[PDB]
Amino acid sequence: MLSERMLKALNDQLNRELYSAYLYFAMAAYFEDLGLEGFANWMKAQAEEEIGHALRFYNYIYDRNGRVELDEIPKPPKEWESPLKAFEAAYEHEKFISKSIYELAALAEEEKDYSTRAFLEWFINEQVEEEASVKKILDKLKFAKDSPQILFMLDKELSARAPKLPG
Template sequence: MNKRMEKLLNEQINLEMYSANAYWAMCSWFSDKDLDGFANYFKVQAKEELFHAEKQFNYIHDVGGKVTIGAIQQPESDFNSVLEVFEITLSHEKAVTKSIGNLIKAAFEESDFATHTFLQWFVTEQVEEEATVSQIISKLKMIGDNSSALYLLNTELAQRTFNAATGGAA
């Protein structure tokens, strides 16, 4: 495959793996506070991110490229509030969306239409991820300091599961 695209896709794999680690750290922060539903939400999120990395890994191999696994930056593990965790998550997902956008732009410039097509799945995925996180942020703002409302949201998020066949959450 095209060397520029190979390099950019490898950087994307690194970003997905960083995302998985960042969400594991958030999962741990919530587990520590016995907010198991929130912990579950981020555990599912981490699985999704590893699924994204694997999808890109497989694609690079499918088109004859080389995967290089680099060092992964250490994520934050201490947070000030539940809301802050989700605000960090949203800004991180926006950065990922931007990165996918840059990849698509590069694929177009290189006339790499296979990669261009491959990346469309991630465009849809990012829309969904940003929407889900934004909804939770809205709910948290409504909840404010009401701990019984927070407990209800915790119960709701405990229901989230990872679908290994599609890589999506339900």
């Protein structure tokens, strides 16, 4: 009840979600190094959220009597010219993930797989939230052009988002 084609498409997205976790982890390491601990914490929390997204794909595949297959996780970029550029890349990256979702939605419509299409509604809606969140910080970073004072401040605000795992 999953087509061989759809399974590959779902396992592929599961892999994109994990890569997406890892990129944020890479971004955390990058903010860490800049000393911006709040930014860094936000990125870890984001990383954890992406692992969550991956598990959602994992559970759906099992629910549909499929079989998860795990693929290499590409090595993410090490750095970025500035916090603003990191967020630009996060944004571009969320835009990339959405497109993959639409493509998945399209394939599910074409196959007449209502289950998978329904399962994806959740990601269509979550991605709206995901892009808006990244956009909102990206713009504050624009508005903070030649001003470390504001960078410092945003850093403190973002630190309110703590990754749920360590403790």
